[PDB]
Structures are given as C-alpha cells and as structure tokens.
C-alpha cells in the first residue's frame, strides 16, 4: 500500500520502501512543458504548473478560474467532443497550437478532470522499419533490429531491450549504443530497480521519460484537485515528475535523459525499450507517438517469436 505523497505528510522514499512511493501522484511536472487541469464540464482551470507563464504567457493565479472556452476557443469544442465523461483514460485529444514564436497540446480525461499538457514541437523509412521487425528470423535478431531502429529514429546514445524474468529481475538482452559507451549487454539487475508499483503503472501507461535527470520538479498548485480534495492522477501525463530515487540512479549512471516504452505480451509487462542520453534531451512529441506505435508492433512480434 502506497505511502501518502510528500505534500500529504508522507516520508521521503528510501531503499527500505521503494515499492511504496506513490509515483502516479507527485503533484509536480518536468520543466520542459506546462500542465493545466480543468473541469470536464465547465472547462474551468483548476490547477496550474507554477511555470505555466513560460509556455502560456499568463501567471498561474491569472489562469486559475479562467475557462478553456476563453483560453482555447478553437480547440474547446473538439476537446469536449473527443473526451466525453466515462471515455477511457488512455484516450487522447491532440492538437498543434500556433504560439507567438508550435505548441503540442495533449489532453486526457480522468473522471471529471481534463489534464492538458503543453510542450514545444519541432513514412517510407518507418514502413521499411516495421518490415525489418516483421522480417527478423528469431527473438535475438528482433531485439537487435528493434534497438537499432529506435536508435536511428531518436538519436539516443543508448537503446536497450530490457527483459523481465519471472522473479522481476531485469536483463539487457540487446542494445544499440554510441561509440565509447560501456556495454550493458547481458548485465542483470535486481527486481527493486524497477519496483512493483512502477511495473504495474507501466502495464497501463506505456511511455514515460525524464528529459533532464538534474531538473527540479515544478509544483502543480493547488496540489489537490479541488473537485475531490484528493491528489490529481498523473500516471497518464508524460510531463509527470519522475521518482527522485529513479532520477538519482540515472545521474549515477551518467544519464542526463531517459525514456522507455512498455513491451506488453498477453497483458503482462514483458520488458522495456529503455533509452538513455548523456546530455538532457527532449524527444520531439511526434517522435514519441512513432515510438509508442513501434512498442505496440514490437509487443506483437515478441509474443510470436518466444512461442517458437
């Protein structure tokens, strides 16, 4: 059972209680984007990341109480139509906004709350890349093709296929890596390195990232959803702040930027496409959607090859 988060008197997480960190409700985001939450009926802005002015041109206390009908007149109708009450929380509305300078808008619904993520935005290849995954003659070749394809798409310094054993230990079973990096191929890691609540979250929410492993989280205020007087679920928000314990592991590994995609086989977390960059690095939003698609395609191909 989860500890309370830090803003509800919960303890700072240690290695004795890795699995009890409520990573889905950090009440904070990464600073490379802005997050608002809004009432799913009124469009009233209820919560604001403290950096909202950087991206949206208005202070949190000025955005607070304004409606999405006022703030996003061109998107609000489509947004309402796209994400009705009771729709799946995996369902996304996506728009490209003109900003005086594009801004990618990603929206999902959790209960009666809309969660709005704003971050800056920037097939012949992909088709051949899919056919390459399809064409791999065994699981090892599939793993190698998948890591090299993702490295070519992203430019990440390292792309690993990280496979879970039945005891939830992990192993790097393939990797594409920059010249000069030390090999992790064949290295195994304890189950606690990706604790049980992270594995559960990653079965439902298939991509997460840390753009800068040194960056302080930006608070969401007010931190509790005024609808519920309870924490705002951020498991479906790519801007969600990462566990400080996970961020520290990456810094100690010389990793400035991390991104992973779930590999899901018969509804169980099989592994991760796990990416590192030495330098902080914001993967463009369009490249993430492509990487989510490849994760789904890889998941289907892994299920087939392992039966053999």
Ligand X SMILES: *C/C=C1/C(=C/c2[nH]c(/C=C3[NH+]=C(/C=C4\NC(=O)C(C=C)=C4C)C(C)=C\3CCC(=O)O)c(CCC(=O)O)c2C)NC(=O)[C@H]1C
Q: Does 302 bind ligand X (CB under 6 A)?
A: no
Distance in Å from the first CA to the final CA of the chain: 38
Contact 94, 208 (CB under 8 A): no
Q: Does 193 bind ligand X (CB under 6 A)?
A: yes
The reply, when asked if residue 87 is annotated as ligand binding, is: no
User: 208 vs 277, which CB is nearer to ligand X?
Assistant: 208
Bond before 163 cis per omega within 30 degrees: no
List 103, 150, 159, 194, residue binding ligand X (CB under 6 A): 194
Rounded to the nearest whole angstrom, what is the least distance from the CB of residue 88 to ligand X in the complex?
Answer: 21
Dihedral angle over CA of 218, 101, 95, 243, nearest 10: -20
User: 24 vs 64, which CB is nearer to ligand X?
Assistant: 24
CA 254 to chain centre: 20
List 147, 257, 260, 290, residue binding ligand X (CB under 6 A): 260
**What sign does the dihedral 231-236-240-245 (CA atoms) show?**
positive
Q: Does 242 bind ligand X (CB under 6 A)?
A: yes
Q: Does 55 bind ligand X (CB under 6 A)?
A: no
Of 227, 231, 236, the closest CA to residue 39 belongs to 227
Number of residues that bind ligand X (CB under 6 A): 25
Give residue for tokens 């997480």: 13
Q: Does 195 bind ligand X (CB under 6 A)?
A: yes
Contacts with 127 (C-beta within 8 Å, 6 or more apart), sequence order: none
Beta bridge partners of 207: 261
Q: Give the nearest residue (CB) to ligand X.
A: 18
Q: Does 23 bind ligand X (CB under 6 A)?
A: yes
User: 82 vs 200, which CB is nearer to ligand X?
Assistant: 200
71 token code pair: 């703030």
Contact 113, 276 (CB under 8 A): no
Q: Does 174 bind ligand X (CB under 6 A)?
A: no
When computed from its CA atoms, the radius of gyration of the chain, rounded to whole angstroms, is 20
Q: Which stretch, 36-44, 73-81, 123-131, 240-248, contacts ligand X (CB under 6 A)? A: 240-248
Q: Which stretch, 95-103, 114-122, 243-251, 297-305, contacts ligand X (CB under 6 A)? A: 243-251
List 245, 264, 282, 291, residue binding ligand X (CB under 6 A): 245
CA 169 to chain centre: 22
Q: Which stretch, 81-89, 93-101, 115-123, 186-194, contacts ligand X (CB under 6 A)? A: 186-194
List 1, 9, 15, 307, residue binding ligand X (CB under 6 A): 15
Give the residue numbers of the binding site for a tetrapyrrole: 18
């Amino acid at each position: 059972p989860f500890f309370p988060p830090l803003y509800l008197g919960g303890p700072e997480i240690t290695t004795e209680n890795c699995e009890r960190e409520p990573i889905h409700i950090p009440g904070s985001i990464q600073p490379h984007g802005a997050l608002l939450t809004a009432d799913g009926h009124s469009g009233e802005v209820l919560q604001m990341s403290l950096n909202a002015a950087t991206f949206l041109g208005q202070e949190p206390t000025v955005l607070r109480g304004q409606t999405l009908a006022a703030l996003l007149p061109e998107q609000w109708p489509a947004l309402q139509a796209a994400l009705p009450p009771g729709c799946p929380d995996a369902l996304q509305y996506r728009a490209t906004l003109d900003w005086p300078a594009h801004l990618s808008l990603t929206v999902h619904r959790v209960g009666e709350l809309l969660i709005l993520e704003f971050e800056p935005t920037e097939p012949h290849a992909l088709r051949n890349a899919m056919f390459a995954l399809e064409s791999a003659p065994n699981l090892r070749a599939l793993a190698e093709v998948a890591t090299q394809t993702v490295r070519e798409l992203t430019g990440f310094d390292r792309v690993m296929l990280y496979k879970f054993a039945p005891d939830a230990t992990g192993e790097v079973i393939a990797e594409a890596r920059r010249e000069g990096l030390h090999a992790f191929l064949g290295h195994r890691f304890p189950a606690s390195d990706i604790p049980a609540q992270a594995r559960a979250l990653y079965t439902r929410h298939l991509l997460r990232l840390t753009a800068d492993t040194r960056a302080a989280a930006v608070p969401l205020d007010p931190v509790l959803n005024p609808q519920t007087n309870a924490p705002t679920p951020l498991g479906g928000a790519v801007l969600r702040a990462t566990s400080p314990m996970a961020m520290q592991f990456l810094r100690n590994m010389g990793v400035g930027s991390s991104l992973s995609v779930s590999v899901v086989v018969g509804g169980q977390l099989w592994g991760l496409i796990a990416c590192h960059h030495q330098t902080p690095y914001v993967l463009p939003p369009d490249l993430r959607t492509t990487l989510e698609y490849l994760g789904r395609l890889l998941s289907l191909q892994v299920q087939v090859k392992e039966a053999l």
